[model samples]
Target: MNIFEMLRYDEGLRLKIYKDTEGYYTIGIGHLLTKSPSLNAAKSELDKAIGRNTNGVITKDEAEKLFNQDVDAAVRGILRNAKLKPIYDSLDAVRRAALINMVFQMGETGVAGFTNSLRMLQQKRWDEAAYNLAKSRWYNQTPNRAKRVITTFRTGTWDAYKNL
Candidate 1:
């Protein structure tokens, strides 16, 4: 499957606002509304996407649109990181998807902080890359999702989607 499908499974869909594991107000397949530029802009986009003021709930199509936009942002975020862009471009499709998945969950800055891990990835040291990743708080916070992404990097395969 593509990064989109993988993210759908990893993030799951939420049609309404809810507190994420980190206590941030999020919705629509992991869009962190709490981190948006401003509350007004956040709600404005939400209304625009859903086509009305919502009592928090959104339509599936609205959620899908938000997910698509976030995915685009994640891709751009990854590419925008000077140190990450070359490494990102060097990976295979499955491995690249894993990086996108990480950026989607933690933002590009968060992923960018993985200097040793990214270096390991850049060197094609799959085991070392996975080892470094598993050593992070990102792994501890969301173990299952982290494991899947790490495994993807380790194997350079779509092994993460096998069960899903």
Candidate 2:
């Protein structure tokens, strides 16, 4: 079956499918798998996770894990399309995709945090841009996930982890 179907087959198995696909099916589990915590619960969970993993900060990985599959797909699909490619191409795919994940998780305002980074990219300031990328609120909230995306961004590589 395709990656989408694999993730949809079972919620608990979603992580296994993600691991099998090597990030190919990551977006599929983004919205579908996460059980919604109450707003207060969400806030507490996020705060603790962020504090533990990223020095009291949140990152793309945390955001993605916290969100559901539909949210992940929307972000990735937007970035994957040709129209968004030009803008996305300016940065490493991993970083760009992580940014997309953040946007997907946090909504428009989260996405907007990258305006300066995008402009820096357009200016071709690689170091400055990368620094800007790290400066984002999406730095290292979900331990495993943050590490995954950070590795991807730093190395411009992609791989599946912990089932997506």
Candidate 3:
């Protein structure tokens, strides 16, 4: 693994606003949490910590990099998932990318729970896999994204998501 991959896999990744084990309000990797109150306060602290102007604030760029690192890590997770290797190898690029995105968002174990979808993919029943994907809570959680994923799974389209 390369440096970023090593950092990513070792550090793990988190995109949402959450608290660290130390009880700091964090977002992205472990970088966002600092001190003070609320997001605005924490971001101000982060800027100071990073040597940016204390007057500075948070931007999505860092989070984007974190998730980008995480996305690749999750792709590796899919390729390495013992049960998924064969199934992943069988898919065309689009299905692979779509599933990698799902794995990034849902986690390797989460995708593992999509037994029916994997079964369908293993059987080369593309429609069933698509249907199974749409039937899940992940789909319900974000139907527009699910639609894109379902469409990619079947059609091999890139399904670029500008809004998400």
Candidate 4:
């Protein structure tokens, strides 16, 4: 399925999906069910949240504010950590999103704190990276999410959830 399909229409679910994947607090922007504010307003709020957290640029923010200051701090902290950024940077957008989602759900310090996994990811070791990802606290915490993301990285296809 496409990225949009995978995320679905539920704002909370979308946020959860993003949280389960990317570790960034993406304020639900253009959801169909929710009467989100104007794109500009959403973008502005998201920018402010991201700016307050990462000192970086954000472009969306409309919808219910599920992410708080603590979540932002954790995201920034993990991104800034040495062991996680390299691996995090090496991932594709989908994979990166998935990783960030996991970080969001599990907290950066908890998952980014993984030493061996970070090393494997930095070295471009696919098998080891997958292994490290699976070993994370997020893996067992959300089995379906973990399975789908890992399968995406392994197969490079969107067929993992077709039957589900």
Candidate 5:
């Protein structure tokens, strides 16, 4: 039930830079360079971390570093969110991980847009939350991953990870 392992499995690491589904320059485990201040700045950071210019490729260690940083950023975003902070605090570890997983891919702002789902989740209304999540473009786009996350929301257990 390590959140990092679960996210790593979901994200699928790549050593070389590649275009994400949205055509953004991404590397490591879903780390989007386009999300940074600039692609040059992002590459410079990666280059510094790897002890030289990455030249589009990063070592496993460097990828791990970025992944950990991204995970931490997601966690921080969740906790810092005034609306989600208390909801997060009231949830069990498994459910918390599910939210973190969602935030990791969607960004906290994106997840926060699920107003109805968030309301249901805050009340621990599992079925409504899952149903709300399923009726969205995210599920349509990433059905496999969304199914597992939806199941996690509904079941409040790590059963979904077994399938993952």
Candidate 6:
């Protein structure tokens, strides 16, 4: 599971940032705000950038705009990245979204680093792609995310897991 899901599961969805038992400026599961660059940026432009004390929260429309822009960029990125262009043209929406998710998680450049995995995708070797995915350090980094991606890649099922 991502740290976000684990936090929601363990503590429910909290709307407020509270201190840890150690009394550090902690928030959002275990994000220490004191040393965080975001907090530093907010401290510098708290009143100017945001009307409130929050680091900054976007309106729903703004959030959606950003989300769409990112998805569009990632989709375009697959085409621009060259390795996945052929498969990108052949992929269905669900499959495209999965690849987009990977490219989002790992930028197009980093995702392109998956030489064999990209090759497998180009060849329509979904099983081999999944195998190469599992063999990576990225899978080791997030077994939960990897499972979701691999399962979706194989079964063509899309399940955004809130928990592992």
- What tens digits encode model 3's per-residue C-alpha lDDT throughout 21-107? 446676665443555567777766656544565333344576656456666677788878877777889888667776776675567
Tell me how many clashing residue pairs each candidate has: 0, 8, 0, 16, 0, 0
Per-residue alpha-carbon lDDT of candidate 6 for residues 91-152, written as tens digits (9 for 90 to 100): 76666666777775566887778888777776778898889878987789767766676766
What residue runs in model 2 are displaced by over 4 Å at the alpha carbon? Answer: 1-28, 32-73, 76-86, 89-96, 159-164
TM-score of each: 0.91, 0.41, 0.62, 0.51, 0.89, 0.64
Give the range of the ten consecutive residues with the poorest summed lDDT in model 6.
6-15
> How does candidate 6 score on lDDT?
0.57
- List, residue by residue over 7-119, the lDDT tens digit for candidate 4: 43212433321221333334443222212435444445545644453222323342333334433454576679776677777766666655554465455777666677667
Q: What is the lDDT of residue 32 in candidate 5?
A: 73
Which consecutive 10 residues in model 4 have the weakest lDDT in total? 16-25
Candidate 4 global CA lDDT score: 0.53
Rank by lDDT, descending?
1, 5, 3, 6, 4, 2
Alpha-carbon error at 54 in model 1, in Å?
Answer: 1.8
lDDT of model 2 at position 114: 63
Query: Relative to the true structure, how large is the alpha-carbon lDDT of every model?
Result: 0.87, 0.46, 0.65, 0.53, 0.84, 0.57
In Å, residue 7's CA in model 6 sits off its true spot by 18
Tens digit of lDDT per residue, candidate 1, span 1-164?
A: 89999999988888877767787777888878765545566666667666788878887888889899989999899888997898899999999999999999899999899998999999999998899899999999999989999999999888778979
**Candidate 4: where are CA atoms >4 Å away?**
1-63, 67-75, 156-164
- The lowest-lDDT stretch of 10 consecutive residues in candidate 2 is 15-24
lDDT of 1 at 96: 93
Once fitted onto the true fold, the runs of candidate 3 whose alpha carbons sit more than 4 angstroms away are 1-61, 159-164
Expressed as tens digits, the lDDT of each residue in 71-126 for candidate 5 is 99999999999877877898888888989999998898998888888889989999
Cα miss at 79, model 5 (Å)?
0.9
